[PDB]
From a paper:
Modulation of voltage-gated potassium (Kv) channels by auxiliary subunits is central to the physiological function of channels in the brain and heart. Native Kv4 tetrameric channels form macromolecular ternary complexes with two auxiliary β-subunits—intracellular Kv channel-interacting proteins (KChIPs) and transmembrane dipeptidyl peptidase-related proteins (DPPs)—to evoke rapidly activating and inactivating A-type currents, which prevent the backpropagation of action potentials. Here we report cryo-electron microscopy structures of the Kv4.2–DPP6S–KChIP1 dodecamer complex, the Kv4.2–KChIP1 and Kv4.2–DPP6S octamer complexes, and Kv4.2 alone. Thus, our data suggest that two distinct modes of modulation contribute in an additive manner to evoke A-type currents from the native Kv4 macromolecular complex.
The structures of Kv4.2–KChIP1 show that the Kv4.2 protomer comprises an N-terminal cytoplasmic domain with an N-terminal hydrophobic segment of approximately 40 residues in length (referred to as the inactivation ball), the T1 domain, a transmembrane domain with six transmembrane helices S1–S6, and the C-terminal cytoplasmic domain. The C-terminal intracellular S6 helix continuously extends from the transmembrane S6 helix toward KChIP1, which was not observed in previous studies. In addition, the intracellular S6 helix interacts with the T1–S1 linker in the structure of the Kv4.2–KChIP1 complex. The Kv4-specific topology of the T1 domain would facilitate the proper interaction between the intracellular S6 helix and KChIP1. The present structure of the full-length Kv4.2–KChIP1 complex reveals that the C terminus of Kv4.2 tightly interacts with both KChIP1 and the N terminus of Kv4.2. The C-terminal cytoplasmic S6 helix continuously extends from the transmembrane S6 helix and terminates at S450, which is localized at the bottom of the complex. The structural comparison between Kv4.2 alone and the Kv4.2–KChIP1 complex provides insight into how KChIPs modulate the gating of Kv4s. First, one KChIP1 stabilizes the S6 conformation as well as the N terminus from the neighbouring subunit of Kv4.2. Third, previous functional studies have suggested that the T1–S1 linker of Kv4 dodecameric channels undergoes major conformational shifts tightly coupled to movements of the S6 tail, although we do not know what the T1 conformational change is. Together, these structural features mediated by KChIP1 may allow synchronized and accelerated S6 gating to enable fast CSI and recovery.
Numbering used by the authors:
A (entry chain A), C (entry chain G): 2 to 35, 40 to 157, 163 to 210, 215 to 450, 472 to 495
B (entry chain L): 36 to 186, 191 to 216
D (entry chain D): 2 to 35, 40 to 63
Write the structure that this text describes.
């Protein structure tokens, strides 16, 4: 290739071996023309390399006819107006062939020089390419967070009520709706808790037999409120099908189903098989607090992100539980009064000991059993202690980046204010010239031409 | 603020001299304006025996015309030119307004009571006479004995010109910088 | 704007399209005058850019008539006495328009060059602005810690006794008062502990019926000491109302109230309803150790700082407790001898299992219940393990920064000693000249003038 | 001190205020001699500063 160009005499010397075993056709050597080092003055700091060094990569700015645009003839040097300490790594490419990433330079300026001089991020050396992408990812995430389109009535009420539903902290009706929904969820769960606990005789009757006449009314009112708010959310979702497919709508429908399901079952016959199941499902209105509190959303995001680690947690937990339950069952089987009737019976003891919980109702009573119980406790500590830090670390990182994006949006509005201020200042500067610099004189002539092609005039 | 506007055009500094002052001026205050808090930092360095903050406060007000709050290089130089290489008349009015703390131009033995006290304060307490509590008042009392005839701007101007001793001391620094 | 100034011929070319649809009034083109690159020698390292590059931002030092002050005429170059490796980022602004922050440069020197050349920290590029503020915050905190005014009798005894109260480690009376207050708190709490425990028959009488004649005397003596020291603190607080509003005074008031409240209650009638409450409140003198030990203050600061995380902890704890209590109640309800009588009854089991505490008195006895109990234990581990590291991390950071500001104050006193030493050396240098450099000769003339305007002389 | 040496004309200008309230003894100004920047070539890379800049820390 052209990279190893100084070794052409070596390759031509190697070709001499072919001549004895060849049939000389007069292969017509090219008969070339015949090397002083040239100056590359990148804004004051002159850089000197041989012209042959640059020409070995004839697809970039430095090795090309493109640098003839940057040639300064009277000084007999090439003058570039670029960074002097980032162009140093440009020349190191033309010598070796691998780019080096400076750890102390901003990656938004490093990529600017690579694009200018024709180099590409695909040719940077393997020595520093892992960190180059790592620093590129952070810059890329900065662009994505800054361009998330958080801006928030030319059409119907759907969009202007969805902006209230999505962001309840704005306006005055959105906050009222948010507060009333939170209060209804809280009163529903508290009412369930109270109707479960006894209140008061023939028997210690709970609050669900003599009472729970108005409790049913409260439950159906809460269910009706949830259904109507879900319908209002549906009437303002541009992604109606995708919105239903979203996790929040799934949680909402799961929360609202039990009342209607129970009514359907109680309309025709009545059994207690699905009564307790529906009562259990009724508490699922708790998860509706995800919209209200950012903490639940962050927790859900961090559980979804490290889903593989939770799978390993479950797999190792099951492995250790099975192994230790089998060991304890076969080691504590022949006891007089033993609760270790089977390995499934030993699952309870194994999961109690592994989590360092301890109950004392089911304990080993053999020398062999106690040693394996202690080993089981230590192994449970080891197994559970592995995925705990990564979950907490991911949660903390996600929370910090969510607070980081909060101030990232704040600076975006500040920049737009300065851009608008510059636009207002530029417009006002023209008026001051009209009432009474170098480029400003020519720029104001363009605006003067724009005035007089439409027979109109800008005014304050 | 041009460099040629404050050239020898009622400013007694040459082009090279203005460059030297601006290089030193912008060295301490890069913003181009120096405030009272910084104004006392440089002045207190020249007189380490005591504190010059009391005198620099009155000095800053004389420099800071119109009580803007900060004194700019444009009107910082014109104060130096008047004081250093200015004429007799311009120096006396500048010093008269330095003593004249209030708006109207009048000295009543109390406006400059702190002025003379500041000069004695900026020496610390290390002198041979060990100073005194009433020694600033004696200096003011003898000061008024030579211009205060009955009980102004005209009196101050004519009194200094009457005795040549102060005259040859006002022009002390025009020859050397 | 003036930033895109090389595209003026493009904008003038675009204006040609207006002419066919215009009404030509002879818009009077400005007829400008008519570009060699200039040298910016910042202390040895010459920097070369076109003059048009600098003029595109005519509100800073480089693009202005202000640089005519730094023009060196005989060398035909602009000589600045600034940092050569920080002025590199100044020129990169005049080309692109965005400042770049060097990761390897001190931010107190970077801001010095920005202020010198007219640039502002508001125009630095978005690529590196998150780091710039973070490094600016650390410098800002360094200024605040160094200027906390920790210096410590021209007026009455109030200030000189408050400095002893605030700082008991100084003087000799402050340490004695600190020790006696600590001893009184310790003896009061130990006396309460002893009077609670039985000391010795008709019955196993505790130490509060046959005894507790002198215990009341000790309690009232301790309460009197607390009240008098609070009054002395009040008699030396310039912020008396704000001092009372402070947390320490509130704790002191809460500690001293119960004795007087009990005396008032027992003056007229006597019931046991508020007796146990006041006895419980009596132990609140423990929290008065906050002044004595810095650890309590650091713990309070770290709890107050991350108060939002504690709120999320409480919310998630209540969520999980309610969910798991409902599940266990509805899963372990029909057992023969079941202690899971209600959801509030299952609250105890849920909070015992989640914290991995374990008691064994209330345990599930069903296959469905045991699985959900194990899931409850694992979920409790997960929920509690999330906010624990952030509390510990904040505590460690606060402790480190509090022990870092300790040596920050030490370097301030040493710095002032060097300043005073220089002042003494400068004064002594003048005396040596009087008894017997370039600038020193002129400076000593100023002091000589100061001597002879007041007919006084400096002496050793 | 010598660190603020470019402000000597400022300090001399401030001293003018003392003269009206002084007793002039002819304090004998030093009458100094009268500034090109010098080169400090530290192994190839020349550094240029005024000589007065270096002399302020003698």
């Amino acid at each position: 290739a052209a990279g190893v160009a100084a070794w052409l005499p070596f390759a031509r010397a190697a070709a001499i071996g072919w001549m004895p075993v060849a049939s000389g056709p007069m292969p017509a050597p090219p008969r070339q023309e015949r090397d002083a080092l040239i100056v590359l003055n990148v804004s004051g700091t002159r850089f000197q390399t041989w012209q042959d060094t640059l020409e070995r990569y004839p697809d970039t700015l430095l090795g090309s006819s493109e640098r003839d645009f940057f040639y300064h003839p009277e000084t007999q040097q090439y003058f570039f107006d670029r960074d002097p300490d980032i162009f140093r790594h440009i020349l190191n490419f033309y010598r070796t062939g691998k780019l080096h990433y400076p750890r102390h330079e901003c990656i938004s300026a490093y990529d600017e020089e690579l694009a200018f001089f024709g180099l590409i991020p695909e040719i940077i050396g393997d020595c520093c390419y892992e960190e180059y992408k790592d620093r590129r990812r952070e810059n890329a995430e900065r662009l994505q967070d800054d361009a998330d389109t958080d801006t928030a009535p030319t059409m119907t009420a759907r969009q202007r009520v969805w902006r209230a539903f999505e962001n309840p902290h704005t306006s005055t009706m959105a906050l009222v709706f948010y507060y009333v929904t939170g209060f209804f969820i809280a009163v529903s769960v508290i009412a369930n808790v109270v109707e479960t606990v006894p209140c008061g005789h023939i028997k210690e009757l709970p609050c669900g037999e003599r009472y729970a006449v108005a409790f049913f009314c409260l439950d159906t009112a809460c269910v009706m409120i949830f259904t109507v708010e879900y319908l209002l959310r549906l009437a303002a979702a541009p992604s109606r099908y995708r919105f239903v497919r979203s996790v929040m709508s799934i949680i909402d429908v799961v929360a609202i189903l039990p009342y209607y399901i129970g009514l359907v079952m109680t309309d025709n016959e009545d059994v207690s098989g699905a009564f307790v199941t529906l009562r259990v499902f009724r508490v699922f209105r708790i998860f509706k607090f995800s919209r209200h509190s950012q903490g639940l959303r962050i927790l859900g995001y961090t559980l979804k992100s490290c889903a593989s680690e939770l799978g390993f947690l479950l797999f190792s937990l099951t492995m250790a539980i099975i192994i230790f339950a089998t060991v304890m069952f076969y080691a504590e089987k022949g006891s007089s009064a033993s609760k270790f009737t089977s390995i499934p019976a030993a699952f309870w003891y194994t999961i109690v000991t592994m989590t360092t919980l301890g109950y004392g109702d089911m304990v080993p009573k053999t020398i062999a059993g106690k040693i394996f119980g202690s080993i089981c406790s230590l192994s449970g500590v080891l197994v559970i202690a592995l995925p705990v830090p990564v979950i907490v670390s991911n949660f903390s990182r996600i929370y910090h980046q969510n607070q980081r994006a909060d101030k990232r949006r704040a600076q975006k509005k500040a920049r737009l204010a300065r851009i608008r201020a510059a636009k207002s200042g530029s417009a006002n500067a023209y008026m001051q010239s009209k009432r009474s610099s170098s480029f400003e004189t020519q720029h104001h002539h363009l605006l003067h031409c724009l005035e007089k092609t439409t027979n109109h005039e800008f005014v304050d | 603020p041009e460099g040629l506007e404050q050239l020898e055009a009622q400013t007694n500094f040459t082009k090279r001299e203005l460059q030297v002052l601006y290089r030193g001026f912008k060295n301490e205050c890069p913003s181009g304006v120096v405030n009272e808090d910084t104004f006392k930092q440089i002045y207190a360095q020249f007189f380490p025996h005591g504190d010059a903050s009391t005198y620099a406060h009155y000095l800053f007000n004389a420099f800071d015309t119109t009580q803007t709050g900060s004194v700019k290089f444009e009107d910082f130089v014109t104060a130096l030119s008047i004081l250093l290489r200015g004429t007799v008349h311009e120096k006396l009015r500048w010093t008269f307004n330095l003593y004249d703390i209030n708006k109207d131009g009048y000295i009543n033995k109390e406006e400059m009571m702190d002025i003379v006290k500041a000069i004695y304060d900026m020496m610390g307490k290390y002198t041979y006479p060990v100073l005194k509590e009433d020694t600033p008042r004696q200096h003011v009392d003898v000061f008024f004995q030579k211009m205060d005839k009955n009980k102004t701007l005209d009196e101050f101007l004519e009194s200094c010109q009457e005795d040549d001793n102060i005259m040859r001391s006002l022009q002390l620094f025009q020859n050397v910088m």
